[PDB]
Amino acid sequence: SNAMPTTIEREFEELDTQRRWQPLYLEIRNESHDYPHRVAKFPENRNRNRYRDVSPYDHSRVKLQNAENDYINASLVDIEEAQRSYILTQGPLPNTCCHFWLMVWQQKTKAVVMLNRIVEKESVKCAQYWPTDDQEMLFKETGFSVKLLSEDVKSYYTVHLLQLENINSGETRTISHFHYTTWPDFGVPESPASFLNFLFKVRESGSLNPDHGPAVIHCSAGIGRSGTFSLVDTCLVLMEKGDDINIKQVLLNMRKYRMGLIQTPDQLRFSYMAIIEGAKCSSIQKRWKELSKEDL
């Protein structure tokens, strides 16, 4: 529709030309406001944090309602401008899987987006908090069980349909669990197409829309891969609404909700590439799907 490169396109060109991705990434690190995270650093919360230096801010943390200790390492990332809100969280610990499902229940979450593998370069990054066989999984501490209803196994992701049961009330909800299986830790998806096909499979289930609770997005720390997913999705939504977006300023605004979103210069560059390609969307999504080779 315009011959002239968009601002984002031109920024990308000269960022690449001048090899300026690391300096831009360092600028974002330098301009990121720190906010209090006292609750994360309570001594009784030590066994609730996977990583010492990845903490939710006091002002945006997700609270476990009606619990002795209401702490979970999870952040409500709220972009009013985009009518978009996500929970970003760490990969649950063996002792916080029960808190995870409580939070999914209380927040009226329909979708969980998992961007990590359980084991990455011989480090355990997440507990297996959902079943893969016909066995009901019990979370006695918060009173939930999870059962696998069905699964769709693609070449680079699986979608699990889960029955989450509040055992105290008998009430059940179907949760879509979108598991990206080939996005390495501190790394990037194989292509903008593979990432975008995944994102649009999440969108198409209705799981990111205002009529459900916030989607829960997690990886290992809930900032790198989770920040990439959330940034791209938020920038795309801002752009269709007709906003003329600065990706750097959108990232600094999302970083006010959860520290350290986007962990590498390459992740930042990939975010740009996915936003540039994503801006082009019924047939565009058809090409992404085929280029993703999801059926191999």
Swiss-Prot record:
Changing residue 185 to A: Substrate-trapping mutant; catalytically inactive it forms a stable complex with physiological substrates including INSR and EGFR. Accumulates in the cytoplasm upon stimulation by insulin or EGF; isoform 2. Keywords: Cell membrane, Cytoplasm, Endoplasmic reticulum, Hydrolase, Membrane, Nucleus, Phosphoprotein, Protein phosphatase, S-nitrosylation. Its EC number is 3.1.3.48. The modification Phosphotyrosine is found at residues 25, 71. It catalyses: O-phospho-L-tyrosyl-[protein] + H2O = L-tyrosyl-[protein] + phosphate. Residues 8-278 form the Tyrosine-protein phosphatase domain. The modification Phosphoserine is found at residues 55, 292. Ubiquitously expressed. Isoform 2 is probably the major isoform. Isoform 1 is expressed in T-cells and in placenta. It comes from the Eukaryota. Induction: Up-regulated by IL4/interleukin-4 (at protein level). GO terms for biological process: B cell differentiation; erythrocyte differentiation; glucose homeostasis; insulin receptor recycling; insulin receptor signaling pathway; negative regulation of cell population proliferation; negative regulation of chemotaxis; negative regulation of epidermal growth factor receptor signaling pathway. The active site is at 219 (phosphocysteine intermediate). One of its GO terms (molecular function) is receptor tyrosine kinase binding. The modification S-nitrosocysteine is found at residue 219. GO terms for cellular component: cytoplasm; cytosol; endoplasmic reticulum; endoplasmic reticulum-Golgi intermediate compartment; endosome lumen; nucleoplasm; nucleus; plasma membrane. It is an enzyme of class 3 (hydrolase). Substrate binds at residues 185, 219-225, 263. Non-receptor type tyrosine-specific phosphatase that dephosphorylates receptor protein tyrosine kinases including INSR, EGFR, CSF1R, PDGFR. Also dephosphorylates non-receptor protein tyrosine kinases like JAK1, JAK2, JAK3, Src family kinases, STAT1, STAT3 and STAT6 either in the nucleus or the cytoplasm. Negatively regulates numerous signaling pathways and biological processes like hematopoiesis, inflammatory response, cell proliferation and differentiation, and glucose homeostasis. Plays a multifaceted and important role in the development of the immune system. Belongs to the protein-tyrosine phosphatase family. Non-receptor class 1 subfamily. Interacts with RMDN3. Isoform 1 interacts with TMED9. Isoform 1 interacts with STX17; dephosphorylates STX17. Interacts with ITGA1 (via cytoplasmic domain); activates the phosphatase activity towards EGFR. Interacts with TRAF2; probably involved in tumor necrosis factor-mediated signaling. Interacts with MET. Interacts with FAM220A and STAT3; interaction with FAM220A promotes interaction of PTPN2 with transcriptional activator STAT3, leading to dephosphorylation of STAT3 by PTPN2 and negative regulation of STAT3 transcriptional activator activity. This is Tyrosine-protein phosphatase non-receptor type 2.
